[PDB]
Amino acid sequence: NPFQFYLTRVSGVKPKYNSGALHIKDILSPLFGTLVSSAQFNYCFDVDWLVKQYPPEFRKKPILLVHGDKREAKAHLHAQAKPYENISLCQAKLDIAFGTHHTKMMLLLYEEGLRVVIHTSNLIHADWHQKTQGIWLSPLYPRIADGTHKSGESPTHFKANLISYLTAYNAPSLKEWIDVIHKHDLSETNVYLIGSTPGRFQGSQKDNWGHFRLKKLLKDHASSMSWPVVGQFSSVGSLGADESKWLCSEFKESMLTLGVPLYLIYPSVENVRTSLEGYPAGGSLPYSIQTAEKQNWLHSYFHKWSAETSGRSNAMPHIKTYMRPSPDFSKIAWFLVTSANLSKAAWGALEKNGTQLMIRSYELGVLFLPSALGLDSFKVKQKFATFPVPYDLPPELYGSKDRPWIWNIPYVKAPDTHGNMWVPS
Ligand SMILES: NC[C@@H](O)c1ccc(O)cc1
């Protein structure tokens, strides 16, 4: 299995749909390595829950929480963490308004080596219970021989790219992690790192982050041959008065680069209502009416969540993925799993006559390119060489009575899976 792409365990589906799936407890298990230290990058944290996910033998090893919380939220997290002597915090600078530290990553230092986990879940119980989430698991990276001269770099430049991603935080606790990474051999890595960090980026720096980073990698490492672009996310930013301000102009331009139909997959109200969680799934799909009403044009692109292939049509998506399938959806030019939702905040927007890329947030994903395996395309695994696309293809268009889930309006005409309504207030 060259991909090491996994879905999270979902409670309440037939065990067969969990056979290849991982829970955070599986990831932190002693079978994965003898744990020495770890760093947990994320957005939302439940500290008490998090510590319980570690096996008892490792619960006392040092843990760094890398978050972007400010003011009261920051003190609240510090409070959550106070009781546990072994936990430190690193607040990621967020100098631009409306930015978040949204990246989900685990750095796991073991006696036997190092593991990097890049994924889509918050460190709270409900993100790992009944949601469709994605995980990339790196191989066990060995420590570089105490007396040898090697970069420990991969053909994909993962080691250096990860270091540059961490370097951008300018944070003392991350420098130690940077030092740990320097000391390991990451050469077996076959994926590309695509990061976002807060900044306004000029000249050659534009290629470093966000959608320009992706455009850059697709230009250098993909080959060109009508192939659609598929985008799949759980949050939607304000994209502009029409499709030509950002979505189809700079954003799609990056995505269609190689060496045109746009499908956007986003849960409808019906998807959420009939889900395993019901309407409360909607708490993690924060599309607000203020944003939606500004951009009714967008919803023509929306397609339903459907994941029969993985038994997860009722497990609402918190994963985010982008890909480039062939016209019959049987193969793909590339696949990306990332924390980046469909927002300018996450991906970048061009400013100052198009000489500046403005990103608001930290995001991180892994791009799977066939060339990194010495292929030209991946065949799509039709039943979750062959890439495990986690939802059904082709995607299904919203019906005429369908609506995009909007989290801050009420739904009171029809009860959900648990006989409940939704009245946010
Ligand atoms: N459910 C908490 C809410 O703040 C939220 C919603 C969506 C996310 O991706 C992360 C957090």
Side-chain angles (χ1 to χ4, degrees), residues 43-44 102 104 120 122 124 127 234-235 283-286 318 320 341 407:
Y43 185 37
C44 287
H102 194 243
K104 300 93 170 51
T120 65
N122 293 276
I124 66 184
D127 266 44
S234 57
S235 174
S284 286
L285 294 165
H318 191 264
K320 314 82 170 54
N341 287 288
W407 81 327

Side-chain angles (χ1 to χ4, degrees), residues 140-145 147-284:
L140 174 54
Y141 296 131
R143 246 218 174 65
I144 285 167
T148 197
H149 329 86
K150 24 168 107 330
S151 59
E153 186 57 278
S154 76
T156 69
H157 298 125
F158 189 90
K159 177 164 176 170
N161 294 159
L162 177 62
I163 286 161
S164 299
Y165 175 76
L166 297 176
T167 294
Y169 285 72
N170 226 18
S173 35
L174 292 180
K175 178 58 151 60
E176 320 284 279
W177 280 102
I178 279 160
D179 285 1
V180 177
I181 286 152
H182 273 300
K183 276 195 255 215
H184 295 69
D185 179 358
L186 285 60
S187 57
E188 305 286 11
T189 310
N190 58 192
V191 286
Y192 290 84
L193 195 60
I194 299 196
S196 294
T197 54
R200 278 167 254 253
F201 299 100
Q202 287 175 147
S204 55
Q205 274 198 331
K206 274 185 327 286
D207 296 349
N208 285 177
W209 316 108
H211 78 81
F212 264 58
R213 164 71 175 174
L214 169 74
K215 170 140 93 4
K216 174 65 174 293
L217 291 172
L218 290 184
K219 170 167 174 210
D220 294 347
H221 306 284
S223 273
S224 193
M225 56 281 314
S226 208
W227 292 47
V229 160
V230 174
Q232 179 282 122
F233 44 85
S234 57
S235 174
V236 190
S238 177
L239 310 190
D242 68 88
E243 36 145 293
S244 71
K245 294 266 180 329
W246 187 82
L247 190 63
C248 285
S249 45
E250 56 184 283
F251 178 68
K252 193 164 104 198
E253 261 319 292
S254 293
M255 294 243 158
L256 60 76
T257 293
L258 276 184
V260 166
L262 183 54
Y263 300 73
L264 301 185
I265 296 169
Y266 179 75
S268 65
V269 170
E270 273 312 289
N271 291 154
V272 168
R273 173 181 86 82
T274 55
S275 74
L276 289 160
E277 294 174 281
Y279 291 127
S284 286

Side-chain angles (χ1 to χ4, degrees), residues 14-28:
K14 293 225 197 115
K16 70 148 166 261
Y17 291 126
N18 282 327
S19 27
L22 302 171
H23 184 81
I24 177 157
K25 270 174 177 124
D26 306 294
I27 300 171
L28 296 179

